[PDB]
């Protein structure tokens, strides 16, 4: 099954469509990184709420375990995680 747009407006503030496997496991797919990921932190809350939890520039692994690094505020996506970007390590 080829799903890349289940609902689409399933969740915003971080473009994610709700996906579940026939076994009843539901995960989130973020079209930004094109990855499938677990229930996200304060990203679904508000960008400034995230900063204490997880930096707006973030690195996570998909269900395939691919790490992606993305600028959440501006919604740019890359693969490269220099702490130089955060100018620290991984928190705003």
Swiss-Prot record:
Regions that span the bilayer: none
Residues with the N6-acetyllysine modification: 66
Glycyl lysine isopeptide (Lys-Gly) (interchain with G-Cter in SUMO2) crosslink residues: 61
Domain WW: from-to ranges: 10-43, 51-84
Tissues where the protein occurs: Expressed in the brain cortex (at protein level). Widely expressed.
Localization of this protein: Nucleus speckle; Nucleus matrix
Superkingdom field: Eukaryota
Positions of post-translational Phosphoserine modification: 21
Subunit structure: Interacts with the N-terminus of HTT. Interacts with the phosphorylated C-terminal domain of POLR2A. Interacts with AKAP8L, SF1, SRPK1, ENAH, ATBF1 and MECP2. Interacts through the WW domains with formin proline-rich regions and with WASL/N-WASP.
Family, as annotated: Belongs to the PRPF40 family.
Job description of the protein: Binds to WASL/N-WASP and suppresses its translocation from the nucleus to the cytoplasm, thereby inhibiting its cytoplasmic function. Plays a role in the regulation of cell morphology and cytoskeletal organization. Required in the control of cell shape and migration. May play a role in cytokinesis. May be involved in pre-mRNA splicing.
Domain text: The WW domains are essential for localization to nuclear speckles.
This protein's name: Pre-mRNA-processing factor 40 homolog A
Organism: Homo sapiens (Human)
Entire protein: shown range: 133 to 220 of 957
């Amino acid at each position: 099954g080829s799903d890349v747009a289940a609902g689409t407006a399933s969740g915003a503030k971080s473009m994610w469509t709700e996906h579940k496997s026939p076994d009843g496991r539901t995960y989130y797919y973020n079209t930004e990184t094109k990855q499938s990921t677990w229930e996200k932190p304060d990203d679904l809350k508000t960008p400034a709420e995230q900063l204490l939890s997880k930096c707006p520039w973030k690195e996570y692994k998909s269900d395939s375990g691919k790490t992606y690094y993305y600028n959440s505020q501006t919604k740019e996506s890359r693969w490269a995680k220099p702490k130089e970007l955060e100018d620290l390590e991984g928190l705003e």
